[PDB]
Short mmCIF file of C-alpha atoms in Angstrom, two decimals:
data_model
loop_
_atom_site.label_atom_id
_atom_site.label_comp_id
_atom_site.label_asym_id
_atom_site.label_seq_id
_atom_site.Cartn_x
_atom_site.Cartn_y
_atom_site.Cartn_z
CA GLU A 1 91.22 -45.19 -6.31
CA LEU A 2 91.36 -42.63 -9.15
CA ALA A 3 94.49 -41.37 -10.85
CA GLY A 4 95.61 -37.84 -9.98
CA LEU A 5 98.62 -36.98 -12.11
CA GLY A 6 98.79 -38.47 -15.61
CA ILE A 7 95.36 -37.08 -16.42
CA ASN A 8 96.23 -34.10 -18.62
CA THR A 9 94.26 -31.99 -21.05
CA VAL A 10 94.72 -32.80 -24.79
CA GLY B 1 91.28 -65.92 -10.46
CA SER B 2 92.36 -62.85 -12.42
CA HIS B 3 90.83 -59.43 -11.68
CA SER B 4 90.62 -55.86 -12.99
CA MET B 5 89.76 -52.32 -11.96
CA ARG B 6 88.39 -49.87 -14.55
CA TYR B 7 87.20 -46.32 -14.45
CA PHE B 8 85.05 -44.91 -17.25
CA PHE B 9 84.45 -41.22 -17.99
CA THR B 10 82.06 -39.58 -20.44
CA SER B 11 81.76 -35.83 -21.02
CA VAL B 12 79.10 -34.43 -23.32
CA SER B 13 79.29 -30.72 -24.21
CA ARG B 14 76.12 -28.64 -23.73
CA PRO B 15 76.31 -25.79 -26.23
CA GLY B 16 74.29 -22.68 -25.47
CA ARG B 17 74.66 -22.86 -21.67
CA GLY B 18 76.90 -24.32 -18.98
CA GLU B 19 79.52 -27.00 -18.40
CA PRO B 20 79.40 -30.48 -19.99
CA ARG B 21 77.36 -33.34 -18.59
CA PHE B 22 79.99 -35.54 -16.91
CA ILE B 23 79.54 -39.16 -15.77
CA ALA B 24 82.23 -41.32 -14.08
CA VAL B 25 81.83 -44.98 -13.03
CA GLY B 26 84.38 -47.30 -11.35
CA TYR B 27 84.35 -51.12 -11.60
CA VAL B 28 86.07 -54.04 -9.99
CA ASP B 29 85.69 -56.85 -12.51
CA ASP B 30 81.99 -56.60 -13.46
CA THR B 31 80.94 -54.83 -10.22
CA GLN B 32 80.33 -51.06 -10.23
CA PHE B 33 81.55 -49.66 -6.90
CA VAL B 34 81.55 -45.87 -7.37
CA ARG B 35 79.89 -43.14 -9.44
CA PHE B 36 79.90 -39.41 -10.13
CA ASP B 37 77.20 -37.53 -12.08
CA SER B 38 77.61 -33.77 -12.56
CA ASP B 39 73.79 -33.49 -12.64
CA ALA B 40 73.22 -35.17 -9.25
CA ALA B 41 72.73 -33.09 -6.07
CA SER B 42 75.56 -34.37 -3.88
CA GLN B 43 78.45 -33.27 -6.12
CA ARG B 44 80.38 -36.09 -4.41
CA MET B 45 81.82 -39.39 -5.52
CA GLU B 46 79.10 -41.84 -4.32
CA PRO B 47 79.30 -45.46 -3.12
CA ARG B 48 77.61 -48.16 -5.26
CA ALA B 49 78.67 -51.41 -3.53
CA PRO B 50 78.39 -52.07 0.22
CA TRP B 51 82.11 -52.96 0.64
CA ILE B 52 83.34 -49.51 -0.46
CA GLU B 53 81.26 -47.90 2.32
CA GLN B 54 83.93 -49.09 4.77
CA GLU B 55 86.17 -46.28 3.45
CA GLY B 56 86.59 -43.19 5.64
CA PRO B 57 85.75 -39.51 4.95
CA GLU B 58 89.29 -38.89 3.71
CA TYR B 59 88.72 -41.47 0.92
CA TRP B 60 85.54 -39.75 -0.29
CA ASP B 61 87.04 -36.24 -0.08
CA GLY B 62 90.06 -37.42 -2.06
CA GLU B 63 88.00 -39.18 -4.73
CA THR B 64 85.58 -36.27 -5.10
CA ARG B 65 88.59 -33.95 -5.58
CA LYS B 66 90.17 -36.09 -8.33
CA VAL B 67 86.94 -36.83 -10.17
CA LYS B 68 85.95 -33.15 -10.34
CA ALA B 69 89.48 -32.49 -11.69
CA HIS B 70 88.86 -35.14 -14.34
CA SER B 71 85.63 -33.30 -15.29
CA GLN B 72 87.49 -30.00 -15.65
CA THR B 73 90.21 -31.64 -17.73
CA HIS B 74 87.52 -32.96 -20.07
CA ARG B 75 85.79 -29.55 -20.14
CA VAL B 76 89.05 -28.01 -21.36
CA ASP B 77 89.51 -30.94 -23.82
CA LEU B 78 86.16 -30.32 -25.50
CA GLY B 79 87.19 -26.73 -26.26
CA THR B 80 90.61 -27.78 -27.57
CA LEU B 81 89.23 -30.60 -29.70
CA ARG B 82 86.69 -28.20 -31.25
CA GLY B 83 89.59 -26.05 -32.47
CA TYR B 84 91.73 -28.98 -33.65
CA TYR B 85 88.87 -30.22 -35.80
CA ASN B 86 87.61 -26.80 -37.01
CA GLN B 87 84.19 -27.51 -35.56
CA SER B 88 81.60 -24.90 -34.65
CA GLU B 89 80.21 -23.97 -31.24
CA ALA B 90 76.68 -25.10 -32.21
CA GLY B 91 77.20 -28.85 -31.98
CA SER B 92 77.37 -31.19 -29.02
CA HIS B 93 80.48 -33.37 -28.79
CA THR B 94 81.69 -36.24 -26.62
CA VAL B 95 84.94 -37.20 -24.98
CA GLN B 96 85.39 -40.62 -23.36
CA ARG B 97 88.32 -41.89 -21.28
CA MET B 98 88.94 -45.37 -19.82
CA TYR B 99 91.79 -46.57 -17.61
CA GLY B 100 92.76 -49.37 -15.25
CA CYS B 101 94.87 -52.40 -14.41
CA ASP B 102 94.55 -56.20 -14.57
CA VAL B 103 96.08 -58.61 -12.04
CA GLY B 104 96.73 -62.35 -12.36
CA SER B 105 95.71 -65.13 -9.95
CA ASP B 106 98.54 -64.10 -7.59
CA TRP B 107 97.05 -60.59 -7.69
CA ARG B 108 100.23 -59.17 -9.25
CA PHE B 109 100.36 -56.68 -12.15
CA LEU B 110 99.48 -58.07 -15.55
CA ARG B 111 98.39 -55.16 -17.77
CA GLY B 112 97.54 -51.44 -17.68
CA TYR B 113 95.30 -49.37 -19.95
CA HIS B 114 94.66 -45.71 -20.65
CA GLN B 115 92.65 -44.78 -23.73
CA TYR B 116 90.76 -41.83 -25.08
CA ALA B 117 88.12 -41.15 -27.74
CA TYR B 118 86.61 -38.08 -29.34
CA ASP B 119 83.09 -38.37 -30.75
CA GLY B 120 83.28 -42.16 -30.33
CA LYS B 121 86.46 -42.68 -32.38
CA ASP B 122 89.96 -43.64 -31.23
CA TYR B 123 91.93 -40.52 -30.40
CA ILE B 124 95.00 -41.57 -28.38
CA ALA B 125 95.86 -44.59 -26.25
CA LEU B 126 98.72 -45.78 -24.10
CA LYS B 127 100.48 -48.76 -25.63
CA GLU B 128 100.81 -52.05 -23.72
CA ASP B 129 104.39 -51.23 -22.64
CA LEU B 130 102.92 -48.13 -20.92
CA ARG B 131 105.85 -46.16 -22.37
CA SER B 132 104.44 -44.84 -25.64
CA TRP B 133 101.27 -43.58 -27.40
CA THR B 134 99.07 -44.59 -30.33
CA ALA B 135 97.76 -41.38 -31.95
CA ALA B 136 95.05 -42.03 -34.54
CA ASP B 137 95.38 -38.81 -36.55
CA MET B 138 97.26 -35.51 -36.64
CA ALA B 139 95.14 -33.84 -33.94
CA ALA B 140 96.03 -36.69 -31.57
CA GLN B 141 99.66 -36.48 -32.75
CA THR B 142 99.79 -32.91 -31.34
CA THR B 143 98.39 -34.31 -28.06
CA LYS B 144 101.01 -37.08 -28.22
CA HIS B 145 103.83 -34.48 -28.29
CA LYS B 146 102.32 -32.42 -25.42
CA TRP B 147 101.98 -35.59 -23.33
CA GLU B 148 105.52 -36.68 -24.12
CA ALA B 149 106.72 -33.21 -23.09
CA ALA B 150 104.74 -33.42 -19.83
CA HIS B 151 105.86 -37.01 -18.98
CA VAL B 152 102.25 -38.28 -18.93
CA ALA B 153 103.17 -41.91 -19.66
CA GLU B 154 105.66 -42.04 -16.76
CA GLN B 155 102.97 -40.58 -14.43
CA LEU B 156 100.33 -43.07 -15.65
CA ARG B 157 102.69 -46.03 -15.52
CA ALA B 158 103.46 -45.25 -11.87
CA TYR B 159 99.72 -45.21 -11.18
CA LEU B 160 98.79 -48.38 -13.14
CA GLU B 161 101.64 -50.50 -11.74
CA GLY B 162 101.39 -49.00 -8.24
CA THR B 163 98.26 -47.32 -6.84
CA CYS B 164 95.86 -49.12 -9.20
CA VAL B 165 96.99 -52.63 -8.23
CA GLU B 166 97.37 -51.76 -4.51
CA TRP B 167 93.78 -50.53 -4.23
CA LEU B 168 92.36 -53.29 -6.41
CA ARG B 169 94.03 -55.73 -4.01
CA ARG B 170 92.46 -53.81 -1.10
CA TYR B 171 88.94 -53.78 -2.64
CA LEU B 172 89.16 -57.52 -3.40
CA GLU B 173 89.87 -58.25 0.29
CA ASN B 174 87.28 -55.86 1.70
CA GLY B 175 84.64 -57.09 -0.75
CA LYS B 176 85.73 -60.74 -0.77
CA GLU B 177 82.29 -62.31 -0.04
CA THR B 178 80.92 -61.03 -3.36
CA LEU B 179 83.95 -60.07 -5.49
CA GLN B 180 85.85 -63.31 -4.88
CA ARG B 181 82.73 -65.51 -5.31
CA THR B 182 81.72 -67.01 -8.70
CA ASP B 183 78.04 -67.50 -9.46
CA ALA B 184 77.73 -70.43 -11.88
CA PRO B 185 75.04 -70.02 -14.56
CA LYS B 186 71.63 -71.49 -13.82
CA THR B 187 70.82 -73.31 -17.07
CA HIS B 188 67.72 -74.78 -18.71
CA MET B 189 66.35 -75.41 -22.19
CA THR B 190 63.09 -74.31 -23.77
CA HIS B 191 61.36 -75.61 -26.90
CA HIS B 192 59.30 -73.51 -29.29
CA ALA B 193 57.67 -74.95 -32.40
CA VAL B 194 58.01 -72.56 -35.35
CA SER B 195 55.96 -74.68 -37.79
CA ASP B 196 54.83 -78.27 -38.24
CA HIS B 197 58.32 -79.07 -39.50
CA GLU B 198 60.75 -77.01 -37.42
CA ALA B 199 61.38 -76.00 -33.80
CA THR B 200 63.58 -73.55 -31.87
CA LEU B 201 65.64 -74.92 -29.00
CA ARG B 202 66.73 -72.17 -26.60
CA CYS B 203 69.53 -72.70 -24.11
CA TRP B 204 69.47 -70.27 -21.15
CA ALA B 205 72.16 -69.14 -18.72
CA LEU B 206 70.80 -67.11 -15.81
CA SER B 207 72.14 -65.46 -12.63
CA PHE B 208 75.83 -65.83 -13.40
CA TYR B 209 78.89 -63.80 -12.33
CA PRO B 210 81.34 -62.76 -13.75
CA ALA B 211 79.80 -61.77 -17.14
CA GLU B 212 82.25 -63.79 -19.25
CA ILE B 213 80.62 -66.98 -20.59
CA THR B 214 80.55 -69.24 -23.68
CA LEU B 215 77.35 -70.84 -25.00
CA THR B 216 77.56 -73.17 -27.99
CA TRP B 217 75.47 -75.73 -29.85
CA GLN B 218 76.59 -79.11 -31.10
CA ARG B 219 74.83 -81.44 -33.54
CA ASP B 220 75.73 -85.08 -33.20
CA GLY B 221 78.79 -83.92 -31.21
CA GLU B 222 80.01 -81.52 -33.92
CA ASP B 223 79.89 -77.71 -33.67
CA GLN B 224 76.78 -75.99 -35.02
CA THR B 225 76.73 -72.25 -35.90
CA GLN B 226 74.30 -72.21 -38.86
CA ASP B 227 70.66 -71.54 -37.95
CA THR B 228 71.77 -70.30 -34.50
CA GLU B 229 71.06 -67.02 -32.69
CA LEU B 230 73.28 -65.84 -29.80
CA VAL B 231 72.12 -62.76 -27.83
CA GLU B 232 74.58 -60.36 -26.24
CA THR B 233 75.19 -60.97 -22.51
CA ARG B 234 72.79 -58.67 -20.57
CA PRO B 235 72.52 -57.49 -16.93
CA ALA B 236 69.76 -59.14 -14.87
CA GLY B 237 69.71 -55.95 -12.77
CA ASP B 238 70.74 -57.59 -9.47
CA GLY B 239 74.49 -57.74 -10.19
CA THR B 240 74.34 -60.98 -12.23
CA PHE B 241 74.09 -61.66 -15.97
CA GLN B 242 71.97 -63.57 -18.49
CA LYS B 243 72.52 -64.97 -21.98
CA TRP B 244 70.89 -67.45 -24.32
CA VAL B 245 71.72 -69.30 -27.57
CA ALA B 246 69.08 -70.76 -29.87
CA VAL B 247 69.06 -73.19 -32.79
CA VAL B 248 66.38 -74.09 -35.35
CA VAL B 249 66.03 -77.85 -35.82
CA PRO B 250 63.82 -80.27 -37.79
CA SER B 251 61.05 -81.40 -35.43
CA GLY B 252 61.67 -84.93 -34.14
CA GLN B 253 65.44 -84.36 -34.30
CA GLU B 254 65.84 -82.43 -31.00
CA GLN B 255 67.91 -85.29 -29.49
CA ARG B 256 70.90 -84.73 -31.86
CA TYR B 257 71.40 -81.26 -30.36
CA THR B 258 73.37 -80.41 -27.22
CA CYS B 259 74.09 -77.08 -25.56
CA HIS B 260 77.51 -76.49 -24.05
CA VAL B 261 78.23 -73.90 -21.33
CA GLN B 262 81.67 -72.73 -20.16
CA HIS B 263 81.96 -70.44 -17.14
CA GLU B 264 84.56 -69.63 -14.43
CA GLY B 265 82.10 -70.94 -11.80
CA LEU B 266 81.79 -74.40 -13.41
CA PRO B 267 84.67 -76.80 -12.56
CA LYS B 268 83.81 -78.65 -15.80
CA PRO B 269 81.60 -77.50 -18.71
CA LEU B 270 77.88 -78.30 -18.72
CA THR B 271 75.95 -80.19 -21.41
CA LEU B 272 72.18 -79.82 -21.81
CA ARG B 273 69.77 -81.87 -23.94
CA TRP B 274 66.10 -81.62 -24.78
CA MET C 1 79.85 -37.34 -36.74
CA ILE C 2 79.64 -41.11 -36.13
CA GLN C 3 76.15 -42.38 -35.32
CA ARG C 4 75.45 -45.93 -34.16
CA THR C 5 71.88 -47.10 -33.62
CA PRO C 6 70.96 -48.81 -30.32
CA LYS C 7 70.48 -52.56 -30.01
CA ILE C 8 67.53 -53.41 -27.73
CA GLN C 9 66.71 -56.38 -25.53
CA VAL C 10 63.53 -56.37 -23.42
CA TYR C 11 63.32 -59.09 -20.77
CA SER C 12 62.47 -59.96 -17.17
CA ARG C 13 64.98 -60.13 -14.30
CA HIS C 14 63.58 -63.50 -13.15
CA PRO C 15 61.78 -66.20 -15.09
CA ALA C 16 58.20 -65.08 -15.77
CA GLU C 17 55.05 -66.51 -14.21
CA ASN C 18 51.66 -64.85 -14.46
CA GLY C 19 50.67 -63.12 -11.22
CA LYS C 20 54.22 -63.21 -9.78
CA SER C 21 56.27 -60.08 -8.95
CA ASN C 22 59.26 -59.42 -11.22
CA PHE C 23 61.39 -56.70 -12.85
CA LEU C 24 61.05 -55.54 -16.45
CA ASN C 25 64.37 -54.67 -18.12
CA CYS C 26 65.21 -52.77 -21.26
CA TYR C 27 68.88 -53.01 -22.13
CA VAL C 28 70.06 -50.57 -24.78
CA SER C 29 73.59 -50.96 -26.09
CA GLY C 30 75.89 -50.23 -29.02
CA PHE C 31 74.72 -46.66 -29.49
CA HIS C 32 76.44 -43.33 -30.18
CA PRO C 33 75.95 -40.49 -29.27
CA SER C 34 74.79 -41.04 -25.67
CA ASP C 35 71.57 -39.01 -25.72
CA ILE C 36 68.73 -41.54 -25.80
CA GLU C 37 65.07 -41.79 -24.86
CA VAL C 38 63.85 -44.98 -23.24
CA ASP C 39 60.37 -45.59 -21.88
CA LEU C 40 58.86 -48.79 -20.50
CA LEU C 41 55.24 -49.28 -21.60
CA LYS C 42 52.28 -51.18 -20.10
CA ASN C 43 49.44 -51.55 -22.60
CA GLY C 44 50.96 -48.68 -24.62
CA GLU C 45 51.14 -46.24 -21.73
CA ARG C 46 54.42 -45.06 -20.24
CA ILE C 47 55.30 -46.45 -16.80
CA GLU C 48 56.25 -43.67 -14.34
CA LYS C 49 58.44 -45.49 -11.78
CA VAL C 50 61.39 -46.16 -14.15
CA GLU C 51 65.07 -46.10 -13.12
CA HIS C 52 68.27 -46.55 -15.16
CA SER C 53 71.94 -47.47 -14.70
CA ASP C 54 74.85 -45.00 -14.74
CA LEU C 55 76.01 -44.37 -18.34
CA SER C 56 79.00 -46.48 -19.30
CA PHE C 57 80.49 -47.88 -22.50
CA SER C 58 82.18 -50.82 -24.28
CA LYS C 59 85.67 -51.19 -25.76
CA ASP C 60 84.43 -49.90 -29.16
CA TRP C 61 83.30 -46.73 -27.29
CA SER C 62 79.60 -47.47 -27.78
CA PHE C 63 77.27 -46.78 -24.83
CA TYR C 64 74.93 -49.00 -22.89
CA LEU C 65 72.22 -48.45 -20.30
CA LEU C 66 69.74 -50.57 -18.40
CA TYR C 67 66.24 -49.25 -17.80
CA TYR C 68 64.15 -51.18 -15.29
CA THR C 69 60.98 -51.14 -13.21
CA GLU C 70 58.92 -53.62 -11.16
CA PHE C 71 56.15 -55.43 -13.06
CA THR C 72 53.85 -58.43 -12.78
CA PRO C 73 53.55 -60.47 -15.93
CA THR C 74 49.96 -61.47 -16.73
CA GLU C 75 48.06 -63.36 -19.40
CA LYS C 76 46.58 -60.22 -20.98
CA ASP C 77 48.84 -57.18 -20.30
CA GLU C 78 51.39 -56.23 -22.95
CA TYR C 79 54.77 -54.82 -21.92
CA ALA C 80 57.29 -53.06 -24.12
CA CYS C 81 60.32 -50.82 -24.41
CA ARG C 82 60.10 -47.59 -26.46
CA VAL C 83 63.44 -46.23 -27.69
CA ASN C 84 64.20 -43.00 -29.55
CA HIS C 85 67.59 -41.84 -30.78
CA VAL C 86 68.99 -39.42 -33.38
CA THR C 87 69.65 -42.48 -35.57
CA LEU C 88 65.96 -43.45 -35.51
CA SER C 89 63.37 -41.73 -37.73
CA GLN C 90 60.65 -42.88 -35.34
CA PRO C 91 60.57 -44.51 -31.86
CA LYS C 92 61.34 -48.21 -31.94
CA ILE C 93 58.96 -50.30 -29.85
CA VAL C 94 60.14 -53.80 -28.94
CA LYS C 95 57.54 -55.97 -27.24
CA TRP C 96 58.36 -58.11 -24.23
CA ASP C 97 58.10 -61.82 -25.04
CA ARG C 98 58.64 -64.21 -22.09
CA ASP C 99 60.24 -66.73 -24.50
CA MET C 100 63.28 -64.43 -24.88
#
């Protein structure tokens, strides 16, 4: 299953 | 044995019109189980191994949602990176992201990863402790501070130590007949004269899984690396892998040479002779 | 702008025997950027029924792809992979050789 939070723009 | 789950993401900007090309693939060990391609018709996360098809509509809705959010994140990134690096609008650029977890033989947490690249170079990566960042340059250092401010590492660490290992465990059980099976290499040797005086001996490993393998030559029981060629492990196309290693030898002397194969699916290593 | 040229292996899925059904593979790896042109050739002419894997990459960030189609090795027919990439001045053609 993919991550949701933690994946932020740079 | 030990196992991993990895997701890979590539976004390539398309200057002149539209959103980036976005491609996402998910793997358990060396088995691809899901994909997304922004250019495909479905606009859904899609199954790629039979054992993920067990999952209900809520799974696919949820994964589609997250993956499209990943693609938008990367779309925004490409714009931001362009400005950080004083690059023009005319060029195409690439962002890549990889993350996942490893588990040991007991299927408990071993390691977590989250790393990121711009135009094929290290940009920023989560350190092994999953508490801090490695920023390659000053553009990435600005990202480091944003991500520290926004508690990114804490959010990722929860995912890599929790959700990641829980679902990997789940996929390993559901897919056990293929994922938890080792396919030992099918080995043989071929002989190819190169002149009247020399010959190539080629040692083959076919149809093996997982991809990890070691092929070596020995001469008179000592290690031989000179006059050898080792090809990179390659997909057969059916889920298994192939590799070979070759050595040039004086003709008539083939018997001094032995090929040694190490693989997870072999209780003990194999030795081949001509 | 970092540019890495593709490595190419051309090979069959199963061991080759003339007259027996098989799959022709062209594995391209180690390249950057990801845009790449790969054709499989039979006697110099592009094969139409050619599929490829979903783009992915290695730890050094370089890309790899598998291109593949059904073929039947024969005594006379020549098979090949044609690759073009920004890093290549002209298309690289690697011939299939059943010994590798």
